[PDB]
Design a protein around this motif. Structure first.
Motif, PDB file in Angstrom:
ATOM      1  N   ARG C  15       0.821  -1.207   0.000  1.00  0.00           N
ATOM      2  CA  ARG C  15       0.000   0.000   0.000  1.00  0.00           C
ATOM      3  C   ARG C  15       0.854   1.256   0.000  1.00  0.00           C
ATOM      4  NH1 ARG C  15      -3.045  -2.473   3.668  1.00  0.00           N
ATOM      5  NH2 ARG C  15      -3.008  -0.972   5.390  1.00  0.00           N
ATOM      6  N   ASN C  16       1.950   1.251   0.738  1.00  0.00           N
ATOM      7  CA  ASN C  16       2.756   2.458   0.795  1.00  0.00           C
ATOM      8  C   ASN C  16       3.561   2.678  -0.466  1.00  0.00           C
ATOM      9  OD1 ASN C  16       2.071   3.787   3.244  1.00  0.00           O
ATOM     10  ND2 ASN C  16       2.803   1.946   4.295  1.00  0.00           N
ATOM     11  N   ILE C  17       3.798   1.632  -1.257  1.00  0.00           N
ATOM     12  CA  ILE C  17       4.363   1.836  -2.584  1.00  0.00           C
ATOM     13  C   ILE C  17       3.398   2.657  -3.434  1.00  0.00           C
ATOM     14  CG2 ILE C  17       4.972   0.665  -4.740  1.00  0.00           C
ATOM     15  CD1 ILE C  17       6.030  -1.665  -2.958  1.00  0.00           C
ATOM     16  N   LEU C  18       2.120   2.262  -3.449  1.00  0.00           N
ATOM     17  CA  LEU C  18       1.124   3.011  -4.214  1.00  0.00           C
ATOM     18  C   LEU C  18       0.958   4.426  -3.670  1.00  0.00           C
ATOM     19  CD1 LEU C  18      -2.246   1.815  -5.607  1.00  0.00           C
ATOM     20  CD2 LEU C  18      -2.195   3.777  -4.078  1.00  0.00           C
ATOM     21  N   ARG C  19       0.896   4.571  -2.349  1.00  0.00           N
ATOM     22  CA  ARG C  19       0.820   5.908  -1.767  1.00  0.00           C
ATOM     23  C   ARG C  19       2.019   6.758  -2.159  1.00  0.00           C
ATOM     24  NH1 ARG C  19      -1.760   7.287   4.030  1.00  0.00           N
ATOM     25  NH2 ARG C  19      -3.504   5.800   4.003  1.00  0.00           N
ATOM     26  N   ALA C  20       3.218   6.178  -2.113  1.00  0.00           N
ATOM     27  CA  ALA C  20       4.407   6.941  -2.464  1.00  0.00           C
ATOM     28  C   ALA C  20       4.352   7.382  -3.917  1.00  0.00           C
ATOM     29  CB  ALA C  20       5.659   6.103  -2.197  1.00  0.00           C
ATOM     30  N   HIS C  21       3.864   6.501  -4.792  1.00  0.00           N
ATOM     31  CA  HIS C  21       3.784   6.819  -6.210  1.00  0.00           C
ATOM     32  C   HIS C  21       2.879   8.018  -6.463  1.00  0.00           C
ATOM     33  CE1 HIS C  21       4.009   6.277 -10.460  1.00  0.00           C
ATOM     34  NE2 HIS C  21       2.760   5.867 -10.592  1.00  0.00           N
ATOM     35  N   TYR C  22       1.703   8.050  -5.835  1.00  0.00           N
ATOM     36  CA  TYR C  22       0.784   9.153  -6.097  1.00  0.00           C
ATOM     37  C   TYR C  22       1.193  10.417  -5.348  1.00  0.00           C
ATOM     38  CZ  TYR C  22      -2.308   6.236  -8.820  1.00  0.00           C
ATOM     39  OH  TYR C  22      -2.833   5.444  -9.805  1.00  0.00           O
ATOM     40  N   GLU C  23       1.765  10.280  -4.152  1.00  0.00           N
ATOM     41  CA  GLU C  23       2.142  11.465  -3.392  1.00  0.00           C
ATOM     42  C   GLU C  23       3.286  12.231  -4.046  1.00  0.00           C
ATOM     43  OE1 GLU C  23       2.651  11.130   0.797  1.00  0.00           O
ATOM     44  OE2 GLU C  23       0.858   9.872   1.075  1.00  0.00           O
ATOM     45  N   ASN C  24       4.225  11.547  -4.703  1.00  0.00           N
ATOM     46  CA  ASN C  24       5.297  12.265  -5.378  1.00  0.00           C
ATOM     47  C   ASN C  24       4.907  12.692  -6.789  1.00  0.00           C
ATOM     48  OD1 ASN C  24       5.497  10.075  -7.090  1.00  0.00           O
ATOM     49  ND2 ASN C  24       7.733   9.938  -6.953  1.00  0.00           N
ATOM     50  N   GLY C  25       3.619  12.657  -7.121  1.00  0.00           N
ATOM     51  CA  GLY C  25       3.166  13.126  -8.414  1.00  0.00           C
ATOM     52  C   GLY C  25       3.393  12.156  -9.544  1.00  0.00           C
ATOM     53  N   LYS C  26       3.511  10.869  -9.239  1.00  0.00           N
ATOM     54  CA  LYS C  26       3.878   9.866 -10.229  1.00  0.00           C
ATOM     55  C   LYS C  26       5.104  10.321 -11.020  1.00  0.00           C
ATOM     56  CE  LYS C  26       0.109   7.992 -12.213  1.00  0.00           C
ATOM     57  NZ  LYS C  26      -0.983   8.186 -13.208  1.00  0.00           N
ATOM     58  N   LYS C  27       6.127  10.774 -10.286  1.00  0.00           N
ATOM     59  CA  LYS C  27       7.367  11.199 -10.925  1.00  0.00           C
ATOM     60  C   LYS C  27       7.990  10.048 -11.698  1.00  0.00           C
ATOM     61  N   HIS C  28       7.971   8.850 -11.122  1.00  0.00           N
ATOM     62  CA  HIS C  28       8.438   7.675 -11.839  1.00  0.00           C
ATOM     63  C   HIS C  28       7.481   7.385 -12.986  1.00  0.00           C
ATOM     64  CE1 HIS C  28       9.874   7.212  -7.638  1.00  0.00           C
ATOM     65  NE2 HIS C  28      10.988   6.829  -8.234  1.00  0.00           N
ATOM     66  N   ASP C  29       8.042   6.989 -14.126  1.00  0.00           N
ATOM     67  CA  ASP C  29       7.247   6.652 -15.304  1.00  0.00           C
ATOM     68  C   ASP C  29       6.668   5.248 -15.108  1.00  0.00           C
ATOM     69  OD1 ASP C  29       6.054   7.105 -17.705  1.00  0.00           O
ATOM     70  OD2 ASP C  29       7.852   6.748 -18.918  1.00  0.00           O
ATOM     71  N   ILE C  30       5.708   5.167 -14.186  1.00  0.00           N
ATOM     72  CA  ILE C  30       5.116   3.908 -13.748  1.00  0.00           C
ATOM     73  C   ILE C  30       3.604   4.084 -13.688  1.00  0.00           C
ATOM     74  CG2 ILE C  30       4.753   2.384 -11.759  1.00  0.00           C
ATOM     75  CD1 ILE C  30       7.747   2.779 -11.094  1.00  0.00           C
ATOM     76  N   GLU C  31       2.875   3.052 -14.097  1.00  0.00           N
ATOM     77  CA  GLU C  31       1.432   2.991 -13.901  1.00  0.00           C
ATOM     78  C   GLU C  31       1.105   1.696 -13.174  1.00  0.00           C
ATOM     79  OE1 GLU C  31      -0.918   5.096 -14.080  1.00  0.00           O
ATOM     80  OE2 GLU C  31       0.275   6.682 -15.022  1.00  0.00           O
TER      81      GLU C  31
END
Ligand code: NAD
Ligand code: NAD
Ligand code: NAD
Ligand code: NAD
Ligand code: MG
Ligand code: MG
Ligand code: MG
Lengths: 336, 336, 336, 336
Positions: C15-31
């Motif tokens: 869950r915190n991987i997904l939270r980290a992804h959205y909180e940093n603005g999806k900076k990583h080119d990941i979906e």
């Protein structure tokens, strides 16, 4: 004219009042001119910046000599245990927010007035001698310009009163008994050690601890119609913040879970908006941490058996109360 | 000749000194004649009967006027914050056990001597002016009849010193660094609030909290050979009792896990018996609650890499220290 | 080239991987195209919205049939315990983030590849068969396009390796022993109950619990120069999140507290920026909650005695590790 | 003829059943012949010897092959998850104490009968298909020799029923609502993670957690007179053991605090002796840890307003219930 405020006792309530003032954009026409505690400016600034229960302060805090600077505002730092010695007259103080826990009578809190302050709001239940007891959103209209020392009631009473008011109006409460399961506070102890209350002398971290509270009876001071109709006690449990009011009462007529919930929903959407909230999600206490409302009614918990009704409301005992202190300050200085 | 003792500060240490005395059958030739605290006899009696960390007192406690009666022994209860005003001369006190945390220097603790007490043992590290600092089992031989105010060191030092002594003799310590993971104490706070130490100002229940300790350097006071060789700090964690010393040191020669453990096992069976114990079971901190030893070496945790050795010892910071206070009392009064 | 990712095991790390992804603005080119756990979409969405340790999710999460919609992104929700049955090929999965704790070998994790996924990153130490073990910021250069199952190491190793690398380069580490004081995790228990590890069978809330960890030795996988030179163990304590690495090592030459701190400050500002941070303020563990860094070196705690050096670093074992999982995903798909 | 008993699920309840049997001197004509769990004999013996909540076992435990020896008694250790495969017939088992939490219906628990056991007592509320639900001291008279699968109810129902029965007999209960502030159990979680109940999915250590309980309605199963008159819910709080029942009810006639307490005092001394106790001391929850009673009524908390009465009773949810399991075992085998 901006109200000049000082905080005496920069603790859980005192600090969270300052934090609430800055976090809400200084919505209230208030300027915090000074704070008083036992520590030096470095200590007060550090505790303002970092908090366990509420995280890091959003703004900037620096130290400059005897001042703590919050978002560019210089706030004088004092450390003097005696209120009558504090320089309130020289600072032109309109209102002292008394949050030490040690001056809760009109006589004791009046020491601030000798120091030169115009008015005092006690952050706790006051003695019988106080000029008023206020649950903002319920009875702030009783305030008068002649009032100089008032009580903002307790966190528990600010949760119970907005909860019970709509139910009394629409259903009527003959009598009620309340239990509040409450987070521990800094008057408790980590491991068994001397205390005036033998139960509070026991480790707060390890046990459920019954303790007396006048919050239920105190609802009669803010809603006179309920005087003598409510009693209760508290159970302190090992949580750092957020508490629960559990009110069982006999209504004047038969009712249902759906009607009881509808009464409080209408109140939260109307007269008591932002003081009382209506929640339908399956939440736990931590979810109401940093919720500024006085009473977060949980519709999911309502029970009705004939005339017997059990209603439950969550409250952040630090954050809701602290925001109400700012509301009451504006009301007191505006009272005619 | 029975030693007449009084306890000044009937808190975690003070109460467990009395408890330990009665639970072990008053093995020490000691009579506790009086206690002094802030409360009335009823409060001190109740806290003696019921404890969170250590359960119910096996014996009987009653109240009779200004006296608390423990297993038929009448003990005077006093409540006077000024030691010089206590009636020690009138009670014929041989030794005052100073456990308030407020009189830790010879100058301050000497107030008991003016009140008529012959000697004082501070239950904490003393100031540099104290006559001696004692870890019982290590250096009580230094005690002299001319000594009047001594320190019993800290709970941590009483654990570290018996651990490091046998290792130094057989392997030699060039230098060492220590971390003690330590239960919270009543000096800490439940939710962030003023403290002289900015880290101790943070909620003990919610965080790992670094704090300075002189225990490692203080081993030099009890073993001058190790002076300057040990340093360390503490990490307070959310447990009500029981702590752990974690010592990493460079030995003078290469060694092994088996040799390290054998050295401490031999010490536990001989010279340091009942001060140092040797444990091989897979246990946790709570299993050492109410263990009277100063140092419970846990052989299962030993690590050795060449010259670097990591040894770990559990200690009940309340119970072990309180028992050592009784030992040091007898040694002090027997000193020639 | 957006990387299509799925999270298998939507727990603390998942869950915190997904939270980290959205909180940093999806900076990583990941979906994140899908998640898999034991519950229905209502359960996974609710736990995404509200968290005890990390509070409320800033974005919006709703449910639409078999999908959980996060900030407008439709994410398929699956509940199937067997990875070979998961529809990875039809979803075009590039990388499975394996966070259940049950498929930590290449053979077990290979079930995802059978399901149609191209690659797997285990969110924990892998078996001997894994293609690589990665501490991002330290050894992501070793990744190769033919690698199909890799390990992101442990939270502890991601804290220790960036700490020890600059010190070995500038001072050299002969050998070192480490203790990590660590928050409890969901593999522990609330009150004593069966566990493969007899110490982890004991209440996590009430005790300090020694437990073995391969994190120190595993630094040899990411920094082969240190293979065989570091060992240690962990002490689990009653905190919900955030842990501390405490490393004692013998440097190859004599050094000082100031030099040790300067080495780590330079690394935090340069090569290891945003992986390693440098802290000089008097903070406690809760202050590093939600800090995305792998290693938050605390200069205030540094101790040096001759060649023996003690360095300590805080790490949010959920948040830092979860952010590193996103980095390693990009590094793995970029490897040539 | 001694009753041959086995424990299926050697957890909090299963282990505390064995400990209660041996600590009370095997007063019951019971011999525990075998236990079944997921672990090996060494693991079960270790957990018997050391407990966080209840301390160290007074007796001796050793391992000999597949057997755990408790105070010289050989007890077979089994590890098989399917009851139908357990060798109950070969061991001549009279009663299976089913304490896994996984076989709570008569259909599932009946697998023990196919395994060769004569009878089964579920250590939790059973499904509606169970032959009887028993609160010992209240309705064990309904037990019959043909009963083969029964429920011992819940810890909450065993506390509530003896509390409400004497009040109903002498005053009469029109209706009642209950809140039980309850210790966390191993069904809850350390940090937010999947659970069938979305509130029990939240960290038990950090929050007050409302959860459903059937304890109030279930009192109607043991006392048909009260069917439909009681409802309630529970609040799980961060305590490891001991819970509180808080019953608010409308009596059929007006009463006083003193009369309510007198009814329960008489009941505690008479019909319900050793099931219900009467307390007048200023105690907290931990003081009732290891109390074998089902209901420890606290007279100090009683509140009465006309017909509305609030009574409170403490119960050790592990220890009281476990002792009652032994009582119900003897009653079941004595039933005609
Ligand atoms: N925390 C809550 O839940 C809560 C809610 C409502 C009301 N209150 C009331 O608010 C008041 C404060 O409680 P708290 O929880 O903030 O306590 P606290 O112990 O957190 O804070 C008290 C502060 O006052 C300081 N202080 C003590 N004596 C002083 C003196 N003589 N002069 C100046 N400063 C002094 C202390 O150092 C501390 O910073 C009490 O009356 C309490 O009952 C608390
Ligand atoms: N608790 C431990 O683990 C531990 C271990 C070793 C040493 N110590 C040391 O022992 C001392 C006592 O610590 P504690 O943990 O018992 O703290 P505590 O707060 O539990 O006990 C202090 C007691 O002294 C009383 N007191 C305070 N001021 C007083 C005064 N002026 N006159 C009389 N009584 C007064 C308090 O009411 C309380 O009963 C400290 O110096 C501490 O550092 C504590
Ligand atoms: N939490 C930490 O501090 C931390 C840090 C680094 C690595 N890790 C590692 O990450 C992994 C997971 O740890 P966690 O703390 O998130 O554990 P957790 O128990 O919080 O999460 C595990 C999740 O997997 C689900 N799950 C279990 N079996 C499954 C299956 N067969 N199929 C699908 N979902 C399944 C569970 O319901 C739960 O949601 C472990 O390997 C752990 O060692 C944890
Ligand atoms: N603990 C309490 O306060 C309490 C009180 C009253 C009733 N209960 C009830 O008693 C039951 C047990 O609860 P607990 O708190 O002891 O739970 P627990 O999780 O502490 O113990 C369950 C035990 O059963 C074992 N187990 C699991 N699956 C098994 C299987 N297939 N075969 C054999 N053993 C297996 C586990 O390893 C563990 O030892 C539940 O029905 C619970 O509701 C518990
Ligand atoms: Mg005198
Ligand atoms: Mg497929
Ligand atoms: Mg069979």
């Amino acid at each position: 004219m901006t109200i000049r405020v000082v905080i005496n006792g920069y603790g859980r309530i005192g600090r969270n009042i300052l934090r609430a003032h800055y976090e809400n954009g200084k919505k209230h026409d208030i300027e915090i001119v000074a704070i008083n505690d036992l520590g030096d400016p470095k200590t007060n600034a550090h505790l303002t910046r970092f908090d366990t229960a509420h995280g890091k302060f959003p703004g900037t805090v620096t130290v400059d000599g005897d001042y703590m600077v919050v978002n560019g505002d210089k706030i004088r730092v004092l450390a003097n245990r005696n209120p009558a010695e504090l320089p309130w007259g020289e600072l032109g103080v309109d209102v002292v927010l008394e949050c030490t826990g040690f001056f809760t009578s009109k006589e004791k809190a009046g020491a601030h007035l000798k120091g030169g302050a115009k008015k005092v709001i006690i952050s706790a239940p006051g003695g019988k001698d106080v000029d008023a007891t206020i649950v903002f959103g319920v009875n702030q209209n009783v305030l008068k310009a002649e009032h100089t020392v008032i009580s903002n009631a307790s966190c528990t009473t600010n949760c119970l009163a907005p909860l019970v008011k709509p139910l009394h109006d629409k259903l009527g409460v003959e009598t009620g008994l309340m239990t509040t399961v409450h987070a521990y506070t800094n008057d408790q102890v980590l491991t068994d050690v001397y205390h005036e209350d033998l139960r509070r002398a026991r480790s707060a971290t390890m046990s459920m601890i019954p303790t007396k509270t006048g919050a239920a009876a105190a609802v009669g001071l803010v809603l006179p119609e309920l005087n003598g109709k409510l009693d209760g006690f508290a159970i302190r449990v090992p949580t750092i913040n957020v508490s629960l009011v559990d009110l069982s009462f006999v209504a004047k007529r038969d009712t249902t879970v759906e009607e009881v919930n509808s009464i409080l929903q209408a109140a939260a959407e109307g007269e008591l908006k932002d003081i009382l909230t209506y929640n339908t999600e399956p939440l736990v206490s931590i979810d109401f941490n940093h919720n500024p409302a006085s009473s977060n009614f949980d519709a999911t918990l309502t029970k009705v058996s004939g005339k017997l009704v059990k209603v439950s409301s969550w409250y952040d005992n630090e954050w809701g109360f602290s925001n109400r202190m700012l509301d009451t300050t504006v009301a007191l200085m505006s009272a005619k």
